């Protein structure tokens, strides 16, 4: 799976800003910032076409500063072990 979640996003990041941050790593099928009645919930999803794209995204972006806030980036499903 090429699915990643991104946590601790600044709540001013919208879908287009998310796309712009992650489009570097591979072909994006979908991506969204999750929101409720009161706006962004501070996390997002990016669905890449490939697993390798997801791994490139994690390598570069996990723990990095997006605005004033370190983001976590992780796979939805981990590799077999």
CATH number at residue 77: 3.30.70.330
Contact 4, 71 (CB under 8 A): no
Resolution (A): 1.9
The total of structural domains in the chain comes to 1
**Domain span at 55:** 1-81
Only one residue has tokens 């991506």, namely 31
Q: How far, in Å, CA of 68 to CA of 70, rounded?
A: 7
User: What contacts 46, CB < 8 A, 6 or more positions away?
Assistant: 3, 4, 6, 18, 22, 28, 30, 31, 57
Query: Which method resolved this structure?
Result: X-ray
Q: Which residues neighbour 69 within 8 Å (Cβ) at sequence distance 6 or greater?
A: 8, 9, 10
């Amino acid at each position: 799976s090429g699915n990643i979640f991104i946590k601790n996003l600044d709540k001013s990041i919208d879908n287009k800003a998310l796309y712009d941050t992650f489009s570097a790593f591979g072909n994006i099928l979908s991506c969204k910032v999750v929101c409720d009645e009161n706006g962004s919930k501070g996390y997002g999803f990016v669905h890449f076409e490939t697993q390798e794209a997801a791994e490139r995204a994690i390598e570069k972006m996990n723990g990095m500063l997006l605005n004033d806030r370190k983001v976590f980036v992780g796979r939805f499903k981990s590799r077999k072990e």
